Motif scaffolding. Structure first.
Motif, PDB file in Angstrom:
ATOM      1  N   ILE A   6     -47.098  88.457  38.088  1.00  0.00           N
ATOM      2  CA  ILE A   6     -47.528  87.332  38.910  1.00  0.00           C
ATOM      3  C   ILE A   6     -46.567  87.185  40.068  1.00  0.00           C
ATOM      4  N   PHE A   7     -47.096  87.238  41.283  1.00  0.00           N
ATOM      5  CA  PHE A   7     -46.262  87.157  42.470  1.00  0.00           C
ATOM      6  C   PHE A   7     -46.635  86.078  43.456  1.00  0.00           C
ATOM      7  N   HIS A   8     -45.615  85.652  44.192  1.00  0.00           N
ATOM      8  CA  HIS A   8     -45.724  84.666  45.255  1.00  0.00           C
ATOM      9  C   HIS A   8     -44.340  84.377  45.792  1.00  0.00           C
ATOM     10  N   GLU A   9     -44.265  84.118  47.089  1.00  0.00           N
ATOM     11  CA  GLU A   9     -43.007  83.775  47.723  1.00  0.00           C
ATOM     12  C   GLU A   9     -43.328  82.755  48.817  1.00  0.00           C
ATOM     13  N   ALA A  10     -42.498  81.720  48.921  1.00  0.00           N
ATOM     14  CA  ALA A  10     -42.710  80.664  49.905  1.00  0.00           C
ATOM     15  C   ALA A  10     -42.434  81.105  51.337  1.00  0.00           C
ATOM     16  N   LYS A  11     -43.076  82.191  51.743  1.00  0.00           N
ATOM     17  CA  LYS A  11     -42.916  82.711  53.093  1.00  0.00           C
ATOM     18  C   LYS A  11     -43.742  83.972  53.275  1.00  0.00           C
ATOM     19  N   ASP A  43     -44.548  65.813  48.971  1.00  0.00           N
ATOM     20  CA  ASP A  43     -43.532  65.882  50.009  1.00  0.00           C
ATOM     21  C   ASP A  43     -42.192  66.207  49.358  1.00  0.00           C
ATOM     22  N   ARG A  44     -41.363  66.983  50.050  1.00  0.00           N
ATOM     23  CA  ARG A  44     -40.065  67.373  49.506  1.00  0.00           C
ATOM     24  C   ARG A  44     -39.185  66.203  49.047  1.00  0.00           C
ATOM     25  N   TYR A  45     -39.110  65.141  49.846  1.00  0.00           N
ATOM     26  CA  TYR A  45     -38.284  64.001  49.469  1.00  0.00           C
ATOM     27  C   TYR A  45     -39.016  62.954  48.628  1.00  0.00           C
ATOM     28  N   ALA A  46     -40.276  63.224  48.294  1.00  0.00           N
ATOM     29  CA  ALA A  46     -41.073  62.296  47.494  1.00  0.00           C
ATOM     30  C   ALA A  46     -40.406  62.004  46.158  1.00  0.00           C
ATOM     31  N   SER A  47     -40.439  60.735  45.752  1.00  0.00           N
ATOM     32  CA  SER A  47     -39.844  60.294  44.487  1.00  0.00           C
ATOM     33  C   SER A  47     -40.468  60.995  43.288  1.00  0.00           C
ATOM     34  N   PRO A  48     -39.677  61.212  42.227  1.00  0.00           N
ATOM     35  CA  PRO A  48     -40.159  61.881  41.017  1.00  0.00           C
ATOM     36  C   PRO A  48     -41.247  61.091  40.308  1.00  0.00           C
ATOM     37  N   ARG A  79     -43.628  69.014  55.356  1.00  0.00           N
ATOM     38  CA  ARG A  79     -42.623  69.438  54.382  1.00  0.00           C
ATOM     39  C   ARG A  79     -43.349  69.369  53.046  1.00  0.00           C
ATOM     40  N   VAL A  80     -43.131  70.353  52.182  1.00  0.00           N
ATOM     41  CA  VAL A  80     -43.828  70.361  50.909  1.00  0.00           C
ATOM     42  C   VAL A  80     -43.128  71.134  49.805  1.00  0.00           C
ATOM     43  N   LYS A  81     -43.336  70.651  48.588  1.00  0.00           N
ATOM     44  CA  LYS A  81     -42.800  71.252  47.377  1.00  0.00           C
ATOM     45  C   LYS A  81     -44.050  71.451  46.529  1.00  0.00           C
ATOM     46  N   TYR A  82     -44.191  72.618  45.912  1.00  0.00           N
ATOM     47  CA  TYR A  82     -45.372  72.879  45.102  1.00  0.00           C
ATOM     48  C   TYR A  82     -45.090  73.752  43.879  1.00  0.00           C
ATOM     49  N   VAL A  83     -45.978  73.673  42.887  1.00  0.00           N
ATOM     50  CA  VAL A  83     -45.856  74.447  41.647  1.00  0.00           C
ATOM     51  C   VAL A  83     -47.251  74.882  41.209  1.00  0.00           C
ATOM     52  N   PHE A  84     -47.378  76.091  40.673  1.00  0.00           N
ATOM     53  CA  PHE A  84     -48.689  76.566  40.246  1.00  0.00           C
ATOM     54  C   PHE A  84     -48.952  76.301  38.778  1.00  0.00           C
ATOM     55  N   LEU A  85     -50.232  76.125  38.446  1.00  0.00           N
ATOM     56  CA  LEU A  85     -50.689  75.894  37.079  1.00  0.00           C
ATOM     57  C   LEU A  85     -51.734  76.975  36.795  1.00  0.00           C
ATOM     58  N   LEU A  86     -51.314  78.043  36.122  1.00  0.00           N
ATOM     59  CA  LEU A  86     -52.198  79.160  35.821  1.00  0.00           C
ATOM     60  C   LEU A  86     -52.755  79.105  34.414  1.00  0.00           C
ATOM     61  N   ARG A 105     -44.056  71.640  33.280  1.00  0.00           N
ATOM     62  CA  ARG A 105     -43.948  71.602  34.735  1.00  0.00           C
ATOM     63  C   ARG A 105     -42.509  71.479  35.230  1.00  0.00           C
ATOM     64  N   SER A 106     -41.730  70.643  34.563  1.00  0.00           N
ATOM     65  CA  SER A 106     -40.345  70.427  34.945  1.00  0.00           C
ATOM     66  C   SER A 106     -39.489  71.695  34.964  1.00  0.00           C
ATOM     67  N   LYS A 107     -39.451  72.393  33.835  1.00  0.00           N
ATOM     68  CA  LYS A 107     -38.639  73.599  33.688  1.00  0.00           C
ATOM     69  C   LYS A 107     -39.029  74.789  34.572  1.00  0.00           C
ATOM     70  N   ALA A 108     -40.230  74.753  35.136  1.00  0.00           N
ATOM     71  CA  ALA A 108     -40.694  75.842  35.988  1.00  0.00           C
ATOM     72  C   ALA A 108     -40.154  75.740  37.411  1.00  0.00           C
ATOM     73  N   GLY A 109     -39.722  74.547  37.803  1.00  0.00           N
ATOM     74  CA  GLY A 109     -39.205  74.369  39.146  1.00  0.00           C
ATOM     75  C   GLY A 109     -40.322  74.098  40.132  1.00  0.00           C
ATOM     76  N   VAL A 110     -40.062  74.328  41.413  1.00  0.00           N
ATOM     77  CA  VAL A 110     -41.081  74.080  42.425  1.00  0.00           C
ATOM     78  C   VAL A 110     -40.746  74.722  43.786  1.00  0.00           C
ATOM     79  N   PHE A 111     -41.618  75.609  44.263  1.00  0.00           N
ATOM     80  CA  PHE A 111     -41.417  76.289  45.543  1.00  0.00           C
ATOM     81  C   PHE A 111     -41.317  75.297  46.703  1.00  0.00           C
ATOM     82  N   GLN A 112     -40.585  75.669  47.751  1.00  0.00           N
ATOM     83  CA  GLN A 112     -40.424  74.786  48.899  1.00  0.00           C
ATOM     84  C   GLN A 112     -40.586  75.432  50.269  1.00  0.00           C
TER      85      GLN A 112
END
Ligand SMILES: OC[C@H]1O[C@@H]2O[C@H]3[C@H](O)[C@@H](O)[C@@H](O[C@H]4[C@H](O)[C@@H](O)[C@@H](O[C@H]5[C@H](O)[C@@H](O)[C@@H](O[C@H]6[C@H](O)[C@@H](O)[C@@H](O[C@H]7[C@H](O)[C@@H](O)[C@@H](O[C@H]8[C@H](O)[C@@H](O)[C@@H](O[C@H]1[C@H](O)[C@H]2O)O[C@@H]8CO)O[C@@H]7CO)O[C@@H]6CO)O[C@@H]5CO)O[C@@H]4CO)O[C@@H]3CO
Ligand SMILES: [Ca+2]
Length: 585
Positions: A6-11, A43-48, A79-86, A105-112
């Protein structure tokens, strides 16, 4: 699901904006391993404690080994932070982020994607989005001026068979005289190979970057062509040969003369002095040991500003763009700057690159706008011409190339069949016209910018260089006007169906047995389906066509009306036939 695949890169080609507020994200995984893909973001600075926006990733296509999923992210913040759900073929779910894979979701992190600057939104000329370009190799297209012919010009006949050094008289005046033909045909731009002063017949060994070659004309004649072409809706793209100069280039000659006393010795890659005038060169050249073509040191500010001025001057004559010859061998800094200069001098000048391998480095949006699609050619050759690959492999190769770069570039790839460097497509087809036409029908409806090589439109044939550079056939009775009309009609369709020039692509059918392949282009509510019976026999297919996208289509080439019964369309095509089905929307 095989997580290692599974591949993806934030760029790059997997993450990029298509506007100052929308980010496109793509993800690939082993074919058939993942059934659903969703993108949770914010949003990147959006509250948890805030709510995570959702986005469904559609299955954009699938090649030999992969499945590609694509989705759009609305980012008002820029600005955005995202995570995939496969989700797998069996409910199994998993989150995918910058940290890794986790069921939480937490332990997987989140691309930016830190920020979307407006100056970094990949932007290409609007005219180049729906163009049909015609490639003119000057020395062989039309001799409109007999008085400027090189010495030793040979006959301009159909049985002519060029040598590496032959001359026939082709010039710019000839082009101008032929504008009616070009316009009748429907081309909207002309790509010229080098037309600057040089001793050869190809002229890639530049002697003077500031003068149209004498056997081709002069500045006035050129200016005249630019104008005559423009008033006919035909733009002009020139061949920039910036990687190397010819041994006649003033700067080189000065070195040949003054040796290391030359104000221009660091304009080249000289290993020792004096400079060789033999078969054993002691200076870097294009390819291996090519005396006539010494390499320019574009890293050298002196050389950069010169070539840049050469750009300014021709841009001042009104040309619409450039094709960068041997572009992958000149530094990135040069191209980034070349882009800023060109695009500031004229926002609608198209920059096309010539790279014969993955060009993603020059296609991020800050250098070239597109490149020659040699991939499209290898697929078309082996599918239609040689028959080495079937409809399913064809589908794959096509799709793998589609995902290579960002959409802005993919949409404008110059899709060619041949060039002044290859045998003529009709010859690759062993003279088989049937196969030839189906390739054209495909080229004129597929995703990209179709590029026509002078003469193919009226039936010319020939082996590789130099037999592919034969003098154009102008006598009407020696031309295949049947083909000419075929080209004309397809060219009209392309201009007429917004789907064909600005839509996306999606495979529709691919039977490797029957060897039938079909795709569908789509923009807004319009759909156009191309069916190709790439076999020497009559065949029958049933294509899955849910009625949500229409239950009726019209064959644009014949005007025949077709209907869907319970979501399935049954077609019957003659040998090598192709239908272009418009959904009327
Ligand atoms: O004098 C040199 C040459 O200059 C001009 O060529 C320019 C050309 O018109 C531009 O399009 C561009 O070239 C790029 C090209 O379009 C890309 O496709 C790519 O090229 C790759 C090839 O596609 C790929 O096949 C491979 O090439 C190998 C060959 O397949 C292989 O057969 C062999 O080639 C030898 C030839 O068989 C042999 O004849 C001889 O070549 C001479 C030519 O026959 C002769 O016409 C002339 O060529 C001119 C040309 O007319 C101009 O338009 O002189 C040649 C020798 O001086 O020798 C060949 C090898 O020595 O080997 C090759 C090498 O792998 O790889 C290439 C590169 O990856 O990239 C090209 C560069 O961007 O630019 C050129 C130069 O400006
Ligand atoms: Ca002439």
């Amino acid at each position: 699901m095989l997580l290692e695949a599974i591949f993806h890169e934030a760029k790059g080609s997997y993450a990029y904006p298509i506007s100052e507020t929308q980010l496109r994200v793509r993800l690939r995984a082993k074919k058939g391993d993942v059934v659903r893909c969703e993108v949770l973001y914010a949003d990147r600075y959006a509250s948890p404690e805030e709510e995570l926006a959702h986005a469904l990733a559609g299955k954009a296509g699938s090649d030999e080994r992969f499945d590609y999923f694509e989705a759009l992210l609305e980012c008002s913040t820029k600005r955005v932070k995202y995570v995939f759900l496969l989700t797998g073929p069996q409910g199994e779910a998993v989150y995918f982020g910058e940290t890794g894979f986790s069921a939480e979701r937490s332990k997987a992190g989140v691309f930016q994607y830190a920020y979307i600057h407006r100056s970094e939104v990949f932007t290409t000329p609007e005219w180049a989005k729906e163009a049909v370009i015609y490639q003119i190799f000057p020395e062989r297209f039309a001799n409109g001026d007999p008085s400027n012919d090189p010495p030793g010009t040979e006959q301009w006949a159909k049985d002519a068979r060029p040598r590496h050094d032959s001359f026939y008289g082709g010039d710019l005046k000839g082009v101008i005289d032929r504008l009616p033909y070009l316009e009748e045909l429907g081309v909207t731009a002309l790509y010229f190979t080098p037309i600057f002063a040089s001793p050869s017949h190809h002229k890639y060994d530049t002697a003077d970057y500031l003068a149209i070659d004498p056997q081709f004309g002069d500045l006035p004649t050129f200016r005249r062509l630019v104008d005559e072409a423009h008033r006919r809706g035909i733009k002009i793209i020139l061949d920039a040969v910036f990687n190397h100069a010819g041994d006649q280039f003033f700067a080189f000659r000065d070195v040949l003369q003054k040796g290391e006393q030359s104000r221009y010795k660091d304009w080249f890659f000289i290993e020792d002095f004096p400079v060789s005038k033999t078969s054993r060169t002691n200076y870097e050249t294009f390819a291996v040991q090519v005396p006539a073509m010494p390499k320019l040191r574009t890293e050298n500010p002196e050389v950069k500003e010169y070539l840049f001025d050469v750009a300014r001057f021709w841009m001042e004559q009104g040309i619409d763009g450039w094709r960068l010859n041997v572009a992958n061998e000149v530094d990135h800094a040069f191209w980034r700057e070349f882009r800023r200069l060109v695009k500031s001098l004229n926002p609608d000048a198209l920059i096309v690159g010539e790279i014969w391998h993955d060009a993603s480095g020059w296609l991020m949006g800050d250098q070239f706008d597109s490149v020659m699609n040699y991939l499209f050619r290898e697929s078309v050759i082996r599918f239609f011409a040689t028959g080495e690959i079937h409809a399913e492999r064809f589908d794959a190769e096509l799709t793998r190339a589609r995902m290579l770069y960002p959409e802005q570039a993919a949409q404008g790839l110059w899709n060619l069949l041949d060039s002044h460097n290859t045998e003529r497509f009709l010859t690759s087809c062993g003279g088989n016209e049937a196969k030839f036409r189906l390739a054209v029908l495909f080229q004129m409806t597929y995703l990209g910018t179709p590029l026509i090589y002078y003469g193919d439109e009226i039936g010319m044939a020939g082996a590789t260089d130099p037999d592919c550079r034969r003098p154009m056939i102008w006598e009407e009775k020696e031309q295949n006007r049947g083909l000419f009309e075929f080209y004309k009609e397809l060219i009209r369709l392309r201009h007429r169906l917004a789907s064909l020039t600005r839509g996306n692509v999606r495979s529709w059918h691919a039977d490797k047995q029957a060897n039938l392949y079909a795709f569908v282009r789509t923009v807004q509510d319009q759909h156009v389906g191309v069916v190709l019976n790439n076999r020497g026999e009559k065949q029958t297919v049933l294509l899955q066509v849910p009625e949500s996208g229409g239950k009726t289509w019209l064959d644009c080439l014949t005007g025949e009306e077709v209907h869907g019964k319970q979501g399935q369309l049954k077609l019957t095509l003659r040998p090598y036939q192709g239908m272009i089905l418009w959904n009327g929307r």
